[PDB]
Amino acid sequence: MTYKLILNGKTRKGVLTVEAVDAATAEKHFKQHANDLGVDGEWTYDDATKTFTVTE
Numbered sequence: 126m127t128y129k130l131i132l133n134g135k136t137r138k139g140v141l142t143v144e145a146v147d148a149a150t151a152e153k154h155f156k157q158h159a160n161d162l163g164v165d166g167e168w169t170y171d172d173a174t175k176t177f178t179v180t181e
């Protein structure tokens with residue numbers, strides 16, 4: 126499925142997407158992104174939209 130990441134960092138904002146066999150495979154992908162972009166935040170997920178948000 127296609128998942129989405131909303132990055133609500135203080136200094137760095139974005140929306141990323143990735144296709145993954147399951148949410149966890151997708152989420153590990155997106156956490157690596159947030160880590161490499163230096164965005165650390167609280168994580169939440171919305172199932173209906175398949176969209177994670179990282180909030181700094």
Ligand SMILES: [Cl-]
Pocket residue numbers: 126127144
């Ligand atoms: Cl798919």
Ligand SMILES: [Cl-]
Pocket residue numbers: 141142143
């Ligand atoms: Cl991506």
Ligand SMILES: [Zn+2]
Pocket residue numbers: 126127144145146
């Ligand atoms: Zn898929």
Ligand SMILES: [Zn+2]
Pocket residue numbers: 141142143154158
């Ligand atoms: Zn990616």
